Amino acid sequence: AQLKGSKTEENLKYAFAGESQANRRYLYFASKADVEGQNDIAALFRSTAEGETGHAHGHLEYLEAVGDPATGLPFGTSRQNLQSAIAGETHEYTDMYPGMAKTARDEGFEEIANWFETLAKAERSHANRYTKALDGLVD
Template sequence: MRQAPELKGSATHERLRRAFDVASRSAQRYLYLATMAEIEGRSNAAGLLRELAETEAVHAQGHLDLIRGVGDPVTGLPIGETDQNLDALISSEIEEGETVYPSMARTARAEGFLDIADWFETMAKVKRGFAARLGELSEMGSGADRS
């Protein structure tokens, strides 16, 4: 009997991560463009774009389902029970709030893009807030909303 190959670290693993990124970005682009179409009074276009956004989100979830056994495609941390998932999300939000967005803000400010720097700084605050909210939920423990 042939043993299944190890997904983690394989080229297929990397392609699944990329596919997840692409589908996730596409879903958000479609939603954004649907909003623009709605503002322009193009309800047919907005409806189709929202439908396609939902389909792209389903695609992203499919990719994530295939990759979940080897870890979160963003953090590499395990995907499993909600407590594990919260820990991975907290880790990601902290990194984005304390490192990623502040670095982007510094670069934008240094290049003279002050409005963009302000936006990145706002995003850093939002991400730190997300981390705090997720942390509060995590501290409640696994029995928090079970009857």
């Protein structure tokens, strides 16, 4: 009866990840079609992407029962949502992207290493800006 700990919980998280990536992929594909002059194709990728947004947000709604897939924290309210966003961003900029940059440099992918470092700096900016917003929140 409890979603927490079930296979269904893991399935919702996986499906949420897949839906999220589908929207991003289809918008990338729309941009390619845009440049090529395939305007009907581009419009279809965009329309389909809107479906994937609906699917992802439906998955997230069920996952309110168990926590944010990125952090395990409760979500729903702006206060909660900001806290979760800050935790997630903090992980990305302190641990994830610097680690990925190091691995890339070690493997000989200097440009991709620099890309990962650019992104570490960007997530730090996002984390700081969300923390400012959380301090300014009136609820």
